[PDB]
Design a binder for these strands. Structure first.
Length: 88
DNA sequence: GGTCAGAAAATCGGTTGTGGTCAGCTGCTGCCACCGGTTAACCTCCAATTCTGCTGCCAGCCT
């Protein structure tokens, strides 16, 4: 929203701004790769009726991505209790 | 002890007249079918035989 209409060159400030932008996505990817086992453990109980196993796991992956989008830390709860709703 | 206007038939066709009649939407109004988002104690790794060709493998003369 700033570079849409305004141009500035602080070199160190722009470098650390891009550093924040990169490492936020690094953090998000690390969180998803941490909770993949939760996704698999939830999806292992729906097998045998209708769909395959890995389709269920990838749908749980989409639900986990949405839960990471919707997560809030100010209420102060364990992440798995919030993410189980979106995965299911 | 014969010719000419009128009357009386269907006949082909235009008027017409209204009497419904059916649909063609047209709101419209309620409703109902369908799609999307959301839920905050915790609990984080699966259910037989026959034949031909190919590749992987190990000793072993040769340099």
């Amino acid at each position: 929203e700033l570079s849409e209409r305004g141009e500035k060159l602080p070199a160190a400030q722009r470098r650390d701004m891009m550093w924040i932008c990169r490492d936020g996505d690094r953090a998000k990817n690390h969180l998803l790769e941490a909770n993949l086992r939760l996704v698999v453990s939830l999806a292992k109980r729906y097998t045998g009726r209708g769909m395959a196993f890995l389709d269920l796991i990838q749908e749980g992956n989409l639900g986990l991505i949405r839960a990471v989008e919707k997560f809030d830390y100010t209420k102060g709860y364990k992440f798995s209790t919030y993410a189980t709703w979106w995965i299911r």
